[PDB]
Amino acid sequence: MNKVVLLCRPGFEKECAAEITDKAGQREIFGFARVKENAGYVIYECYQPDDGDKLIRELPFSSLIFARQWFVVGELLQHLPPEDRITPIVGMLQGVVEKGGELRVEVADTNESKELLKFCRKFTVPLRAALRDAGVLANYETPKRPVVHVFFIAPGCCYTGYSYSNNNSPFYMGIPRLKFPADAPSRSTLKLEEAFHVFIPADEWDERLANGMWAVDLGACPGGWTYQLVKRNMWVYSVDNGPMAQSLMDTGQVTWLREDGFKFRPTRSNISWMVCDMVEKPAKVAALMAQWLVNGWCRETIFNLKLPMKKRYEEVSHNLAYIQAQLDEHGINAQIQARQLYHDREEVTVHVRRIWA
Numbered sequence: 001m002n003k004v005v006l007l008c009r010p011g012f013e014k015e016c017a018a019e020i021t022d023k024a025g026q027r028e029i030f031g032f033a034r035v036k037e038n039a040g041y042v043i044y045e046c047y048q049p050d051d052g053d054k055l056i057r058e059l060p061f062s063s064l065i066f067a068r069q070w071f072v073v074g075e076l077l078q079h080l081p082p083e084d085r086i087t088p089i090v091g092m093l094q095g096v097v098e099k100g101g102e103l104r105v106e107v108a109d110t111n112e113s114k115e116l117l118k119f120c121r122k123f124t125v126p127l128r129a130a131l132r133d134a135g136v137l138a139n140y141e142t143p144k145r146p147v148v149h150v151f152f153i154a155p156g157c158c159y160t161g162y163s164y165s166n167n168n169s170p171f172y173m174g175i176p177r178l179k180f181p182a183d184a185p186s187r188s189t190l191k192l193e194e195a196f197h198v199f200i201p202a203d204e205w206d207e208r209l210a211n212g213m214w215a216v217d218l219g220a221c222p223g224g225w226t227y228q229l230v231k232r233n234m235w236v237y238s239v240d241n242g243p244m245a246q247s248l249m250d251t252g253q254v255t256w257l258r259e260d261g262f263k264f265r266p267t268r269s270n271i272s273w274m275v276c277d278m279v280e281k282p283a284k285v286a287a288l289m290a291q292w293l294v295n296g297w298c299r300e301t302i303f304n305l306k307l308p309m310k311k312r313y314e315e316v317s318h319n320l321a322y323i324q325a326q327l328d329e330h331g332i333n334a335q336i337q338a339r340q341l342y343h344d345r346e347e348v349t350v351h352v353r354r355i356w357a
Helices: 013-026 053-056 086-093 115-136 189-198 200-210 224-231 280-292 310-328
Strands: 003-007 039-044 069-073 101-105 147-152 157-163 214-218 237-240 256-257 270-276 300-306 334-339 349-354
Touching: 003 013, 003 053, 003 157, 013 039, 039 053, 053 069, 069 147, 086 115, 086 157, 101 115, 115 147, 115 349, 189 224, 189 300, 189 334, 189 349, 214 224, 224 237, 224 256, 224 270, 280 300, 280 310, 280 349, 310 334, 310 349
Parallel strands: 101 147, 214 237, 214 270, 237 256, 270 300
Antiparallel strands: 003 039, 003 069, 069 157, 147 157, 300 349, 334 349
């Protein structure tokens, strides 16, 4: 199979297409990605017949910024007989994957597909039963086996395929479903919560987002991101000339430092986490993040970079390369990952973890 579908934010198809072409090419997995503006997905079509499976095995999904999710697919099923949409799907998947561990019947995240999304929910159980009967799905679900995807691009038109659960998004449509807590002081809180879900494996939260850790939130006012750190029972320095929500102060976990986030330097505590969601130019933010890493002021950081109006994949790649150049110059080893989260708009969220053994 030679096609790989990538789900993206509608309007970001050129970024997602350039990026997958670039990073697959770098691994000598050559192909082309046509763009349908505002479709909310891109198809990367490999020149070689079975390179689609190779690509979703060998390229780490975590290294893709503009893809919410991906999966390899066969040919487009275009005329699904309304009297039996199931048989052709089963037919297309039979002999392609067996004993899959989970089924996800998905759509692109656009306005036009909302009715189609409800169809997919209705279709899921009947399709699951048929795929289990055919041996395409295992009789018992399991996270270790491949995830089977059936992707409807319009009524009666879908692709079918799979992704590997150790190299994909674990979320339906690549969208973690979060509820805004009425007591948080800003909806920006959902970005950082989504970041924790997307970047830190759930079974590592208690160790890496740990009770008792010290964290610094730069440009914190009024406290959306601080709220998430407090929820993890961290002790937090919220740094801003603006005041923090009284509800956060009342927790007894937060010290408000009335300073500029760019000027603040930590002295005193062992800071594990720093986070930064600021309305500033991304080269400027990236420079401050690199300084925090190379000065050893944090072990991990999550921060947002604003995208410019044009050359958005390039700009954000250059910001990341700057941070990597700083790391390399100082001999610091770290893992960097970045993603246009669901709750991001014209920005990307980045996670950097120093490797200290």
